[PDB]
A and B are shown apart, each in its own frame.
Chain A
Amino acid sequence: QRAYANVNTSLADAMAVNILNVKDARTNVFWADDAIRIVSQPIPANHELFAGMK
Protein backbone atom coordinates (compact mmCIF):
# COMPACT_ATOMS: atom_id res chain seq x y z
CA GLN A 1 0.00 0.00 0.00
CA ARG A 2 2.92 2.36 0.64
CA ALA A 3 4.10 1.79 -2.93
CA TYR A 4 1.34 4.14 -4.14
CA ALA A 5 2.26 7.13 -1.97
CA ASN A 6 2.04 10.58 -3.56
CA VAL A 7 2.56 12.99 -0.63
CA ASN A 8 5.02 13.04 2.24
CA THR A 9 2.69 13.33 5.26
CA SER A 10 -0.97 12.53 5.90
CA LEU A 11 -3.52 15.12 6.98
CA ALA A 12 -2.67 16.05 10.57
CA ASP A 13 -5.57 17.69 12.43
CA ALA A 14 -5.68 21.47 12.23
CA MET A 15 -3.66 21.89 9.03
CA ALA A 16 -4.54 25.04 7.13
CA VAL A 17 -6.16 24.63 3.72
CA ASN A 18 -4.77 27.19 1.27
CA ILE A 19 -7.18 28.14 -1.49
CA LEU A 20 -5.33 28.54 -4.77
CA ASN A 21 -7.88 30.44 -6.86
CA VAL A 22 -8.24 33.88 -5.30
CA LYS A 23 -9.47 35.91 -8.29
CA ASP A 24 -11.58 35.34 -11.36
CA ALA A 25 -9.37 33.98 -14.12
CA ARG A 26 -9.90 32.06 -17.33
CA THR A 27 -8.15 28.70 -17.12
CA ASN A 28 -5.40 27.47 -19.40
CA VAL A 29 -5.48 23.67 -19.39
CA PHE A 30 -2.59 21.28 -19.91
CA TRP A 31 -2.61 17.51 -19.68
CA ALA A 32 -1.14 14.26 -20.91
CA ASP A 33 -3.04 13.18 -23.99
CA ASP A 34 -4.44 9.98 -22.43
CA ALA A 35 -5.77 11.69 -19.28
CA ILE A 36 -9.21 12.43 -20.80
CA ARG A 37 -11.46 9.83 -22.43
CA ILE A 38 -14.68 10.20 -24.41
CA VAL A 39 -16.68 6.99 -24.03
CA SER A 40 -19.35 6.79 -26.74
CA GLN A 41 -22.10 4.31 -27.59
CA PRO A 42 -25.16 4.21 -29.84
CA ILE A 43 -28.66 4.37 -28.47
CA PRO A 44 -29.76 0.74 -27.90
CA ALA A 45 -31.81 -0.52 -30.82
CA ASN A 46 -34.82 -1.77 -28.82
CA HIS A 47 -34.92 0.96 -26.18
CA GLU A 48 -38.23 1.77 -24.50
CA LEU A 49 -37.97 5.19 -26.11
CA PHE A 50 -37.30 5.15 -29.85
CA ALA A 51 -40.09 2.58 -29.98
CA GLY A 52 -41.68 3.03 -33.39
CA MET A 53 -38.99 5.40 -34.63
CA LYS A 54 -36.91 4.24 -37.57
Chain B
Amino acid sequence: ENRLESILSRFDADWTASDEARREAKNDLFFSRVSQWDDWLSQYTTLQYRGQFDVVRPVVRKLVSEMRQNPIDVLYRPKDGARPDAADVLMGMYRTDMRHNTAKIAVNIAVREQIEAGVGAWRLVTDYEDQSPTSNNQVIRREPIHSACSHVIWDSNSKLMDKSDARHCTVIHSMSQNGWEDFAEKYDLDADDIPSFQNPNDWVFPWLTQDTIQIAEFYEVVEKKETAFIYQDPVTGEPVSYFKRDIKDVIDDLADSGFIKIAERQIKRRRVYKSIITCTAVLKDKQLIAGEHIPIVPVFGEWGFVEDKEVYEGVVRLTKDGQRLRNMIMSFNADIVARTPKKKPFFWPEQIAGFEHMYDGNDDYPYYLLNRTDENSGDLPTQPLAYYENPEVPQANAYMLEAATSAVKEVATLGVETYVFQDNLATAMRRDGEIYQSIVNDIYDVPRNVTILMAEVVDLATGEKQVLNDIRGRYECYTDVGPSFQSMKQQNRAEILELLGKTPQGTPEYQLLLLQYFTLLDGKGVEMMRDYANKQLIQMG
Protein backbone atom coordinates (compact mmCIF):
# COMPACT_ATOMS: atom_id res chain seq x y z
CA GLU B 1 0.00 0.00 0.00
CA ASN B 2 2.88 2.33 0.78
CA ARG B 3 3.86 4.55 -2.12
CA LEU B 4 7.50 3.67 -1.47
CA GLU B 5 6.68 -0.04 -1.41
CA SER B 6 4.83 0.12 -4.73
CA ILE B 7 7.60 2.18 -6.34
CA LEU B 8 10.29 -0.18 -5.06
CA SER B 9 8.33 -3.26 -6.15
CA ARG B 10 8.15 -1.87 -9.68
CA PHE B 11 11.82 -0.88 -9.66
CA ASP B 12 12.95 -4.25 -8.34
CA ALA B 13 10.91 -6.03 -11.01
CA ASP B 14 12.40 -3.93 -13.81
CA TRP B 15 15.94 -4.12 -12.41
CA THR B 16 15.75 -7.91 -12.16
CA ALA B 17 14.22 -8.22 -15.63
CA SER B 18 16.86 -6.08 -17.38
CA ASP B 19 19.86 -7.73 -15.72
CA GLU B 20 21.62 -9.67 -18.49
CA ALA B 21 21.34 -7.00 -21.17
CA ARG B 22 22.61 -4.31 -18.81
CA ARG B 23 25.60 -6.41 -17.78
CA GLU B 24 26.57 -7.11 -21.39
CA ALA B 25 26.14 -3.45 -22.33
CA LYS B 26 28.32 -2.30 -19.43
CA ASN B 27 30.94 -4.83 -20.49
CA ASP B 28 30.82 -3.54 -24.07
CA LEU B 29 31.20 0.07 -22.92
CA PHE B 30 34.18 -0.86 -20.74
CA PHE B 31 35.68 -2.95 -23.55
CA SER B 32 35.39 -0.17 -26.12
CA ARG B 33 36.27 2.82 -23.87
CA VAL B 34 38.69 1.80 -21.08
CA SER B 35 40.56 -1.45 -21.63
CA GLN B 36 40.11 -4.76 -23.42
CA TRP B 37 41.87 -6.58 -20.56
CA ASP B 38 38.98 -7.06 -18.13
CA ASP B 39 38.86 -8.70 -14.67
CA TRP B 40 40.44 -6.15 -12.40
CA LEU B 41 41.11 -7.57 -8.96
CA SER B 42 41.44 -11.16 -9.95
CA GLN B 43 43.08 -12.61 -6.86
CA TYR B 44 45.25 -15.03 -8.85
CA THR B 45 47.15 -12.45 -10.88
CA THR B 46 50.92 -12.08 -11.22
CA LEU B 47 52.84 -9.60 -13.38
CA GLN B 48 52.86 -10.64 -17.03
CA TYR B 49 52.77 -8.81 -20.33
CA ARG B 50 49.24 -7.78 -21.26
CA GLY B 51 49.36 -5.67 -24.42
CA GLN B 52 46.37 -4.05 -26.09
CA PHE B 53 46.51 -4.47 -29.87
CA ASP B 54 43.28 -3.01 -31.16
CA VAL B 55 41.22 -3.67 -34.27
CA VAL B 56 37.65 -2.86 -33.13
CA ARG B 57 38.32 0.80 -32.28
CA PRO B 58 39.09 1.93 -35.86
CA VAL B 59 35.80 0.33 -36.92
CA VAL B 60 33.91 2.08 -34.12
CA ARG B 61 35.51 5.40 -35.07
CA LYS B 62 34.60 4.88 -38.73
CA LEU B 63 30.97 4.11 -37.87
CA VAL B 64 30.69 7.07 -35.48
CA SER B 65 32.10 9.44 -38.10
CA GLU B 66 29.69 8.07 -40.70
CA MET B 67 26.75 8.63 -38.37
CA ARG B 68 28.00 12.13 -37.54
CA GLN B 69 28.25 13.13 -41.19
CA ASN B 70 24.49 12.58 -41.71
CA PRO B 71 22.58 14.43 -38.98
CA ILE B 72 18.86 13.87 -38.43
CA ASP B 73 16.39 16.27 -36.82
CA VAL B 74 12.66 16.65 -36.30
CA LEU B 75 10.49 18.18 -39.03
CA TYR B 76 6.90 19.08 -38.20
CA ARG B 77 4.54 18.94 -41.18
CA PRO B 78 0.88 19.97 -41.46
CA LYS B 79 -1.68 17.19 -41.11
CA ASP B 80 -4.23 16.19 -43.73
CA GLY B 81 -6.87 18.88 -44.13
CA ALA B 82 -5.05 21.24 -41.76
CA ARG B 83 -4.02 24.77 -42.65
CA PRO B 84 -1.04 24.71 -45.04
CA ASP B 85 1.21 26.47 -42.49
CA ALA B 86 0.02 24.56 -39.43
CA ALA B 87 3.58 23.68 -38.38
CA ASP B 88 5.53 26.93 -38.82
CA VAL B 89 5.23 28.15 -35.22
CA LEU B 90 6.06 24.76 -33.70
CA MET B 91 8.99 24.26 -36.07
CA GLY B 92 10.28 27.73 -35.21
CA MET B 93 10.06 27.02 -31.49
CA TYR B 94 11.81 23.66 -31.89
CA ARG B 95 14.63 25.18 -33.94
CA THR B 96 14.91 28.03 -31.44
CA ASP B 97 15.33 25.94 -28.31
CA MET B 98 17.13 22.98 -29.90
CA ARG B 99 19.96 24.94 -31.55
CA HIS B 100 22.23 25.00 -28.51
CA ASN B 101 25.34 22.90 -27.99
CA THR B 102 23.60 20.84 -25.32
CA ALA B 103 21.02 19.26 -27.64
CA LYS B 104 23.66 18.35 -30.22
CA ILE B 105 25.95 16.91 -27.56
CA ALA B 106 23.13 14.84 -26.06
CA VAL B 107 22.25 13.34 -29.44
CA ASN B 108 25.93 12.64 -30.16
CA ILE B 109 26.43 10.91 -26.80
CA ALA B 110 23.35 8.76 -27.34
CA VAL B 111 24.48 7.84 -30.86
CA ARG B 112 27.98 6.85 -29.75
CA GLU B 113 26.60 4.68 -26.96
CA GLN B 114 24.18 3.14 -29.47
CA ILE B 115 27.09 2.24 -31.73
CA GLU B 116 29.26 0.73 -28.95
CA ALA B 117 26.98 -0.69 -26.24
CA GLY B 118 23.62 -0.98 -27.98
CA VAL B 119 21.43 1.54 -26.17
CA GLY B 120 21.70 5.25 -25.51
CA ALA B 121 19.21 7.84 -24.35
CA TRP B 122 18.63 11.51 -23.68
CA ARG B 123 16.16 13.64 -21.73
CA LEU B 124 13.97 16.69 -22.26
CA VAL B 125 13.56 19.18 -19.41
CA THR B 126 11.81 22.52 -18.93
CA ASP B 127 13.54 25.46 -17.25
CA TYR B 128 12.70 29.07 -16.41
CA GLU B 129 14.52 31.80 -18.32
CA ASP B 130 14.13 35.57 -18.09
CA GLN B 131 16.78 36.75 -20.57
CA SER B 132 16.16 34.69 -23.73
CA PRO B 133 13.04 32.57 -23.27
CA THR B 134 11.52 30.57 -26.08
CA SER B 135 8.01 31.52 -24.95
CA ASN B 136 6.11 32.26 -21.74
CA ASN B 137 9.38 32.95 -19.89
CA GLN B 138 10.36 29.28 -20.19
CA VAL B 139 12.67 27.11 -22.28
CA ILE B 140 12.74 23.43 -23.23
CA ARG B 141 16.21 21.93 -23.41
CA ARG B 142 17.66 18.51 -24.17
CA GLU B 143 20.09 16.91 -21.74
CA PRO B 144 22.47 13.95 -22.02
CA ILE B 145 22.25 10.63 -20.26
CA HIS B 146 25.57 8.84 -19.81
CA SER B 147 25.48 5.05 -19.55
CA ALA B 148 21.76 4.86 -20.17
CA CYS B 149 21.96 1.06 -20.04
CA SER B 150 22.53 1.17 -16.28
CA HIS B 151 21.21 4.66 -15.46
CA VAL B 152 17.75 4.44 -17.06
CA ILE B 153 15.56 1.51 -16.01
CA TRP B 154 12.45 1.20 -18.15
CA ASP B 155 9.13 -0.39 -17.30
CA SER B 156 9.47 -4.09 -18.03
CA ASN B 157 6.09 -4.51 -19.74
CA SER B 158 6.99 -2.37 -22.75
CA LYS B 159 7.10 -4.12 -26.12
CA LEU B 160 8.00 -1.06 -28.23
CA MET B 161 11.42 0.12 -29.32
CA ASP B 162 10.88 3.77 -28.43
CA LYS B 163 9.22 2.80 -25.12
CA SER B 164 6.04 4.76 -25.81
CA ASP B 165 3.92 2.11 -24.05
CA ALA B 166 5.99 2.21 -20.85
CA ARG B 167 3.88 3.31 -17.89
CA HIS B 168 6.86 4.34 -15.75
CA CYS B 169 10.63 4.78 -15.85
CA THR B 170 13.32 5.42 -13.24
CA VAL B 171 16.54 7.37 -13.82
CA ILE B 172 19.41 6.92 -11.36
CA HIS B 173 21.61 9.88 -10.42
CA SER B 174 25.06 9.36 -8.92
CA MET B 175 26.75 12.39 -7.38
CA SER B 176 29.74 13.33 -5.26
CA GLN B 177 29.39 15.47 -2.13
CA ASN B 178 29.28 18.78 -4.03
CA GLY B 179 27.05 17.25 -6.68
CA TRP B 180 24.64 16.15 -3.96
CA GLU B 181 24.76 19.61 -2.40
CA ASP B 182 23.82 21.20 -5.73
CA PHE B 183 21.12 18.58 -6.37
CA ALA B 184 19.52 19.17 -2.97
CA GLU B 185 19.78 22.93 -3.46
CA LYS B 186 18.05 22.77 -6.84
CA TYR B 187 15.25 20.43 -5.72
CA ASP B 188 14.84 22.00 -2.24
CA LEU B 189 15.87 18.80 -0.47
CA ASP B 190 17.63 18.19 2.84
CA ALA B 191 21.35 18.21 2.11
CA ASP B 192 22.12 16.93 5.62
CA ASP B 193 20.34 13.59 5.07
CA ILE B 194 22.61 11.78 2.61
CA PRO B 195 20.53 9.66 0.19
CA SER B 196 21.02 6.12 -1.03
CA PHE B 197 19.77 3.90 -3.84
CA GLN B 198 20.92 1.01 -5.98
CA ASN B 199 24.46 1.54 -7.20
CA PRO B 200 24.42 1.20 -11.02
CA ASN B 201 28.24 1.12 -11.38
CA ASP B 202 30.96 -1.43 -10.67
CA TRP B 203 34.46 -1.13 -9.21
CA VAL B 204 35.90 -2.63 -12.37
CA PHE B 205 38.87 -0.25 -12.81
CA PRO B 206 41.50 0.94 -10.31
CA TRP B 207 39.85 4.39 -10.23
CA LEU B 208 41.09 5.62 -6.88
CA THR B 209 37.84 7.37 -5.89
CA GLN B 210 34.36 6.16 -6.82
CA ASP B 211 30.98 7.79 -6.34
CA THR B 212 28.88 7.18 -3.24
CA ILE B 213 25.63 9.20 -3.30
CA GLN B 214 22.65 7.95 -5.31
CA ILE B 215 19.13 9.25 -5.92
CA ALA B 216 16.40 8.15 -8.29
CA GLU B 217 13.74 9.98 -10.28
CA PHE B 218 10.61 7.91 -10.88
CA TYR B 219 8.34 9.01 -13.73
CA GLU B 220 4.85 7.58 -14.13
CA VAL B 221 2.15 8.19 -16.74
CA VAL B 222 -1.49 8.28 -15.66
CA GLU B 223 -4.12 8.19 -18.41
CA LYS B 224 -7.57 9.23 -17.21
CA LYS B 225 -10.63 11.22 -18.20
CA GLU B 226 -10.61 14.73 -16.77
CA THR B 227 -13.08 17.57 -16.94
CA ALA B 228 -12.77 20.13 -19.73
CA PHE B 229 -14.55 23.48 -19.94
CA ILE B 230 -16.08 24.56 -23.24
CA TYR B 231 -16.14 28.34 -23.59
CA GLN B 232 -17.04 30.80 -26.34
CA ASP B 233 -14.18 32.93 -27.59
CA PRO B 234 -15.05 36.66 -27.39
CA VAL B 235 -13.60 37.04 -30.89
CA THR B 236 -15.23 34.04 -32.60
CA GLY B 237 -15.84 30.33 -32.16
CA GLU B 238 -15.71 28.09 -29.10
CA PRO B 239 -12.45 26.90 -27.48
CA VAL B 240 -11.83 23.95 -25.17
CA SER B 241 -9.60 24.45 -22.14
CA TYR B 242 -8.71 21.89 -19.48
CA PHE B 243 -10.23 22.44 -16.06
CA LYS B 244 -7.06 21.34 -14.27
CA ARG B 245 -4.92 23.89 -16.13
CA ASP B 246 -7.05 26.80 -14.86
CA ILE B 247 -8.59 25.08 -11.85
CA LYS B 248 -8.09 27.98 -9.45
CA ASP B 249 -5.88 30.51 -11.20
CA VAL B 250 -8.22 32.08 -13.75
CA ILE B 251 -11.55 30.30 -13.35
CA ASP B 252 -13.18 33.68 -12.65
CA ASP B 253 -10.64 35.78 -14.58
CA LEU B 254 -12.03 34.09 -17.70
CA ALA B 255 -15.50 35.33 -16.75
CA ASP B 256 -14.18 38.84 -16.07
CA SER B 257 -12.36 38.86 -19.41
CA GLY B 258 -15.59 37.87 -21.13
CA PHE B 259 -15.60 34.10 -21.56
CA ILE B 260 -18.99 32.40 -21.19
CA LYS B 261 -19.01 28.68 -20.48
CA ILE B 262 -21.07 26.75 -23.02
CA ALA B 263 -20.78 23.17 -21.75
CA GLU B 264 -18.39 20.78 -20.00
CA ARG B 265 -17.05 17.49 -21.39
CA GLN B 266 -14.76 14.79 -20.00
CA ILE B 267 -11.70 14.27 -22.20
CA LYS B 268 -9.14 11.52 -21.66
CA ARG B 269 -5.48 12.48 -21.49
CA ARG B 270 -2.21 11.49 -19.84
CA ARG B 271 -0.29 13.24 -17.09
CA VAL B 272 3.34 12.66 -16.09
CA TYR B 273 4.34 12.61 -12.42
CA LYS B 274 7.88 12.66 -11.02
CA SER B 275 9.04 11.45 -7.60
CA ILE B 276 12.47 11.79 -5.99
CA ILE B 277 13.18 8.52 -4.21
CA THR B 278 15.94 7.01 -2.14
CA CYS B 279 16.03 3.39 -1.06
CA THR B 280 14.46 4.31 2.30
CA ALA B 281 11.89 7.06 1.70
CA VAL B 282 10.17 9.16 -0.96
CA LEU B 283 11.44 12.74 -0.98
CA LYS B 284 9.05 14.30 -3.53
CA ASP B 285 5.75 12.55 -4.06
CA LYS B 286 3.95 13.24 -7.35
CA GLN B 287 5.34 16.48 -8.77
CA LEU B 288 3.35 16.97 -11.96
CA ILE B 289 5.48 17.84 -14.99
CA ALA B 290 4.58 19.16 -18.42
CA GLY B 291 3.69 16.81 -21.25
CA GLU B 292 1.91 13.54 -21.88
CA HIS B 293 5.00 11.37 -22.37
CA ILE B 294 7.94 10.31 -20.24
CA PRO B 295 10.67 12.84 -21.08
CA ILE B 296 13.32 10.20 -21.84
CA VAL B 297 14.04 9.27 -25.46
CA PRO B 298 15.89 5.94 -25.96
CA VAL B 299 18.02 5.04 -28.99
CA PHE B 300 18.70 1.40 -29.85
CA GLY B 301 21.02 -0.53 -32.13
CA GLU B 302 20.04 -4.14 -32.71
CA TRP B 303 16.90 -4.61 -30.62
CA GLY B 304 14.46 -7.43 -30.04
CA PHE B 305 12.89 -9.93 -27.68
CA VAL B 306 14.14 -13.50 -27.34
CA GLU B 307 11.80 -15.12 -24.81
CA ASP B 308 9.94 -12.36 -22.95
CA LYS B 309 13.42 -10.86 -22.47
CA GLU B 310 14.61 -7.77 -24.30
CA VAL B 311 18.05 -7.98 -25.92
CA TYR B 312 20.04 -5.28 -27.67
CA GLU B 313 23.48 -5.25 -29.24
CA GLY B 314 25.83 -2.75 -30.82
CA VAL B 315 28.89 -3.43 -32.97
CA VAL B 316 31.31 -4.48 -30.23
CA ARG B 317 29.65 -7.46 -28.53
CA LEU B 318 30.39 -10.03 -31.23
CA THR B 319 34.02 -8.97 -31.77
CA LYS B 320 35.05 -9.34 -28.13
CA ASP B 321 36.03 -13.02 -28.32
CA GLY B 322 38.27 -12.51 -31.33
CA GLN B 323 39.83 -9.36 -29.91
CA ARG B 324 40.57 -11.01 -26.57
CA LEU B 325 42.09 -14.02 -28.33
CA ARG B 326 44.28 -11.74 -30.44
CA ASN B 327 45.45 -9.75 -27.41
CA MET B 328 46.29 -12.96 -25.56
CA ILE B 329 48.21 -14.44 -28.50
CA MET B 330 50.18 -11.25 -29.07
CA SER B 331 51.03 -11.15 -25.36
CA PHE B 332 52.26 -14.74 -25.54
CA ASN B 333 54.43 -13.91 -28.55
CA ALA B 334 55.86 -10.84 -26.80
CA ASP B 335 56.78 -13.08 -23.87
CA ILE B 336 58.43 -15.46 -26.34
CA VAL B 337 60.55 -12.62 -27.71
CA ALA B 338 61.46 -11.31 -24.25
CA ARG B 339 62.20 -14.35 -22.06
CA THR B 340 63.93 -16.82 -24.31
CA PRO B 341 67.65 -17.66 -24.44
CA LYS B 342 69.47 -16.43 -27.54
CA LYS B 343 71.50 -18.46 -30.04
CA LYS B 344 74.95 -19.08 -28.53
CA PRO B 345 77.42 -21.97 -28.73
CA PHE B 346 77.56 -24.82 -26.24
CA PHE B 347 81.07 -25.28 -24.86
CA TRP B 348 82.72 -27.49 -22.38
CA PRO B 349 84.74 -25.30 -20.00
CA GLU B 350 87.89 -27.23 -20.93
CA GLN B 351 87.29 -26.60 -24.63
CA ILE B 352 87.92 -22.87 -24.21
CA ALA B 353 89.80 -22.76 -20.90
CA GLY B 354 92.50 -20.16 -21.40
CA PHE B 355 90.92 -18.63 -24.52
CA GLU B 356 87.91 -17.26 -22.65
CA HIS B 357 88.53 -13.75 -24.07
CA MET B 358 88.10 -14.70 -27.74
CA TYR B 359 84.34 -15.33 -27.58
CA ASP B 360 83.30 -12.45 -25.33
CA GLY B 361 82.47 -10.39 -28.40
CA ASN B 362 85.53 -8.38 -29.36
CA ASP B 363 86.92 -8.34 -32.89
CA ASP B 364 90.64 -8.30 -32.07
CA TYR B 365 91.40 -11.77 -33.41
CA PRO B 366 91.42 -13.40 -36.85
CA TYR B 367 90.09 -16.79 -35.66
CA TYR B 368 89.14 -18.71 -32.52
CA LEU B 369 91.42 -21.13 -30.70
CA LEU B 370 90.24 -24.21 -28.81
CA ASN B 371 92.08 -26.53 -26.46
CA ARG B 372 92.99 -29.86 -28.04
CA THR B 373 94.42 -32.08 -25.30
CA ASP B 374 93.54 -33.33 -21.84
CA GLU B 375 96.08 -35.04 -19.61
CA ASN B 376 93.84 -37.82 -18.28
CA SER B 377 91.92 -38.62 -21.48
CA GLY B 378 94.68 -38.24 -24.07
CA ASP B 379 92.66 -36.03 -26.41
CA LEU B 380 89.42 -34.09 -26.20
CA PRO B 381 86.36 -35.96 -27.55
CA THR B 382 85.26 -34.89 -31.02
CA GLN B 383 81.64 -33.80 -31.49
CA PRO B 384 80.08 -31.17 -33.78
CA LEU B 385 79.40 -27.90 -32.01
CA ALA B 386 75.83 -27.14 -30.92
CA TYR B 387 74.09 -23.77 -30.88
CA TYR B 388 71.00 -22.83 -28.91
CA GLU B 389 68.05 -22.73 -31.29
CA ASN B 390 66.69 -19.33 -32.25
CA PRO B 391 63.39 -18.21 -30.71
CA GLU B 392 60.43 -19.04 -32.93
CA VAL B 393 56.74 -18.18 -32.82
CA PRO B 394 54.78 -21.45 -33.04
CA GLN B 395 52.70 -22.23 -36.08
CA ALA B 396 49.73 -22.53 -33.71
CA ASN B 397 50.24 -18.99 -32.44
CA ALA B 398 50.65 -17.62 -35.97
CA TYR B 399 47.60 -19.44 -37.32
CA MET B 400 45.49 -18.39 -34.34
CA LEU B 401 46.54 -14.74 -34.58
CA GLU B 402 45.69 -14.60 -38.27
CA ALA B 403 42.38 -16.43 -37.78
CA ALA B 404 41.28 -14.34 -34.79
CA THR B 405 42.03 -11.10 -36.62
CA SER B 406 40.17 -12.41 -39.67
CA ALA B 407 37.18 -13.33 -37.51
CA VAL B 408 37.09 -9.86 -35.97
CA LYS B 409 37.26 -8.22 -39.39
CA GLU B 410 34.50 -10.49 -40.70
CA VAL B 411 32.15 -9.91 -37.76
CA ALA B 412 32.78 -6.19 -37.15
CA THR B 413 30.79 -5.09 -40.20
CA LEU B 414 27.69 -3.19 -39.10
CA GLY B 415 25.27 -3.60 -41.97
CA VAL B 416 26.66 -4.28 -45.43
CA GLU B 417 26.67 1.15 -43.83
CA THR B 418 24.65 2.51 -40.91
CA TYR B 419 21.19 2.55 -42.50
CA VAL B 420 19.49 0.58 -39.72
CA PHE B 421 21.20 2.60 -37.00
CA GLN B 422 20.22 5.87 -38.67
CA ASP B 423 16.67 4.54 -38.95
CA ASN B 424 16.62 3.78 -35.22
CA LEU B 425 17.94 7.28 -34.56
CA ALA B 426 15.16 8.65 -36.77
CA THR B 427 12.61 6.67 -34.76
CA ALA B 428 14.02 8.19 -31.58
CA MET B 429 13.86 11.68 -33.07
CA ARG B 430 10.22 11.13 -34.05
CA ARG B 431 9.42 10.15 -30.46
CA ASP B 432 11.38 13.22 -29.35
CA GLY B 433 9.22 15.37 -31.60
CA GLU B 434 6.07 13.86 -30.11
CA ILE B 435 7.24 14.60 -26.57
CA TYR B 436 8.32 18.12 -27.51
CA GLN B 437 4.95 18.84 -29.11
CA SER B 438 3.14 17.70 -25.97
CA ILE B 439 5.35 19.80 -23.68
CA VAL B 440 4.94 22.82 -25.96
CA ASN B 441 1.17 22.49 -25.81
CA ASP B 442 1.45 22.27 -22.03
CA ILE B 443 3.65 25.27 -21.23
CA TYR B 444 4.39 27.43 -24.27
CA ASP B 445 2.15 30.15 -25.69
CA VAL B 446 0.95 28.63 -28.97
CA PRO B 447 -0.69 31.23 -31.26
CA ARG B 448 -3.75 30.31 -33.29
CA ASN B 449 -3.78 31.52 -36.90
CA VAL B 450 -6.96 33.18 -38.20
CA THR B 451 -7.82 33.63 -41.88
CA ILE B 452 -10.04 36.70 -41.39
CA LEU B 453 -3.06 36.82 -38.24
CA MET B 454 -1.86 35.03 -35.09
CA ALA B 455 -4.15 35.63 -32.09
CA GLU B 456 -2.56 34.83 -28.71
CA VAL B 457 -5.46 34.68 -26.24
CA VAL B 458 -4.07 34.70 -22.68
CA ASP B 459 -4.78 36.31 -19.32
CA LEU B 460 -3.16 37.03 -15.97
CA ALA B 461 -4.25 35.87 -12.53
CA THR B 462 -4.55 37.95 -9.36
CA GLY B 463 -1.05 36.84 -8.32
CA GLU B 464 0.34 38.41 -11.52
CA LYS B 465 1.02 34.90 -12.89
CA GLN B 466 0.01 34.30 -16.50
CA VAL B 467 -1.82 31.07 -17.37
CA LEU B 468 -1.56 30.04 -21.00
CA ASN B 469 -4.80 29.23 -22.85
CA ASP B 470 -4.24 26.54 -25.49
CA ILE B 471 -7.25 25.21 -27.38
CA ARG B 472 -7.75 21.48 -27.93
CA GLY B 473 -7.30 21.93 -31.69
CA ARG B 474 -3.56 21.66 -31.06
CA TYR B 475 -2.38 18.54 -32.92
CA GLU B 476 -2.46 20.20 -36.33
CA CYS B 477 0.92 18.79 -37.40
CA TYR B 478 2.59 15.40 -37.47
CA THR B 479 6.25 14.48 -37.17
CA ASP B 480 8.70 13.59 -39.94
CA VAL B 481 12.50 13.49 -40.10
CA GLY B 482 14.54 15.93 -42.14
CA PRO B 483 17.97 17.52 -42.36
CA SER B 484 19.23 19.26 -39.24
CA PHE B 485 18.89 23.05 -39.32
CA GLN B 486 19.52 25.89 -36.89
CA SER B 487 16.83 28.36 -37.96
CA MET B 488 13.76 28.69 -40.13
CA LYS B 489 15.67 31.03 -42.44
CA GLN B 490 18.27 28.30 -43.02
CA GLN B 491 15.52 25.75 -43.65
CA ASN B 492 13.83 28.07 -46.15
CA ARG B 493 17.16 28.64 -47.91
CA ALA B 494 17.64 24.88 -48.20
CA GLU B 495 14.13 24.43 -49.61
CA ILE B 496 14.59 27.20 -52.18
CA LEU B 497 17.94 25.75 -53.24
CA GLU B 498 16.42 22.28 -53.60
CA LEU B 499 13.63 23.66 -55.80
CA LEU B 500 16.17 25.67 -57.81
CA GLY B 501 18.37 22.66 -58.53
CA LYS B 502 15.43 20.87 -60.17
CA THR B 503 13.58 23.71 -61.92
CA PRO B 504 14.72 24.22 -65.54
CA GLN B 505 15.74 27.67 -66.72
CA GLY B 506 12.45 29.53 -67.21
CA THR B 507 10.34 32.05 -65.33
CA PRO B 508 10.13 30.06 -62.05
CA GLU B 509 13.93 29.92 -62.17
CA TYR B 510 14.02 33.72 -62.03
CA GLN B 511 11.39 33.67 -59.28
CA LEU B 512 13.33 31.19 -57.14
CA LEU B 513 16.65 32.99 -57.63
CA LEU B 514 15.14 36.31 -56.55
CA LEU B 515 13.55 34.52 -53.60
CA GLN B 516 16.94 33.14 -52.57
CA TYR B 517 18.48 36.61 -52.73
CA PHE B 518 15.52 37.79 -50.65
CA THR B 519 16.06 35.15 -47.94
CA LEU B 520 19.84 35.61 -47.87
CA LEU B 521 21.62 36.93 -44.78
CA ASP B 522 22.86 40.49 -44.40
CA GLY B 523 26.10 42.36 -44.96
CA LYS B 524 26.58 45.24 -47.38
CA GLY B 525 26.87 43.62 -50.81
CA VAL B 526 24.29 40.97 -50.01
CA GLU B 527 22.21 43.83 -48.60
CA MET B 528 22.33 45.56 -51.98
CA MET B 529 21.38 42.34 -53.77
CA ARG B 530 18.54 41.64 -51.34
CA ASP B 531 17.12 45.14 -51.73
CA TYR B 532 17.26 44.72 -55.50
CA ALA B 533 15.60 41.30 -55.33
CA ASN B 534 12.77 42.58 -53.14
CA LYS B 535 12.21 45.48 -55.53
CA GLN B 536 12.13 43.12 -58.51
CA LEU B 537 9.66 40.70 -56.92
CA ILE B 538 7.37 43.54 -55.83
CA GLN B 539 7.49 45.22 -59.25
CA MET B 540 6.75 41.88 -60.91
CA GLY B 541 3.78 41.39 -58.59
Contact = CB atoms under 8 A, between A and B. Distances in A.
Contacts of B203: 41-42
Contacts of B39: 45-46
B12 to A, nearest CB: 14
A43 B204 CA distance: 11
Interface in A20-53: 41-48
Interface in B482-515: none
Contacts of B41: 41-45
A41 B43 CA distance: 12
Interface in B23-56: 39-44
A43 B43 CA distance: 9
5 contacts: A41-B203, A43-B41, A44-B41, A45-B39, A45-B42
Interface of A: 41-48
A43 B202 CA distance: 12
A41 B42 CA distance: 12
Contacts of A44: 41-43
Nearest to A46: B42
Nearest to A43: B41
A43 B203 CA distance: 10
Q: Select the residue from B39, B40, B41 with max chain A CB neighbours within 10 A.
A: B41
Contacts of A47: 43
A46 to B, nearest CB: 5
A22 B39 CA distance: 53
A23 B203 CA distance: 46
A41 B44 CA distance: 15
Nearest to B41: A44
B165 to A, nearest CB: 30
A44 B40 CA distance: 8
Nearest to B39: A45
B206 to A, nearest CB: 9
A45 B43 CA distance: 8
Given A41-B41, A45-B41, 16 more contacts: A41-B203, A42-B41, A42-B203, A43-B41, A44-B41, A44-B42, A44-B43, A45-B39, A45-B40, A45-B42, A46-B39, A46-B42, A46-B43, A46-B44, A47-B43, A48-B43
Contacts of A41: 41, 203
Contacts of B42: 44-46
A39 to B, nearest CB: 10
Nearest to A48: B43
A36 B344 CA distance: 54
Contacts of B43: 44, 46-48
A43 to B, nearest CB: 8
Closest 5 A-B residue pairs measured CB to CB? A44-B43, A42-B203, A44-B41, A47-B43, A46-B42
B219 to A, nearest CB: 28
A48 B44 CA distance: 10
Nearest to B43: A44
Contacts of B44: 46
Q: Select the residue from B39, B42, B43 with max chain A CB neighbours within 10 A.
A: B43
B298 to A, nearest CB: 26
Contacts of A45: 39-42
Interface in B41-77: 41-44
B531 to A, nearest CB: 71
B496 to A, nearest CB: 61
A36 to B, nearest CB: 17
Q: Select the residue from A45, A47, A48 with max chain B CB neighbours within 10 A.
A: A45
A54 to B, nearest CB: 9
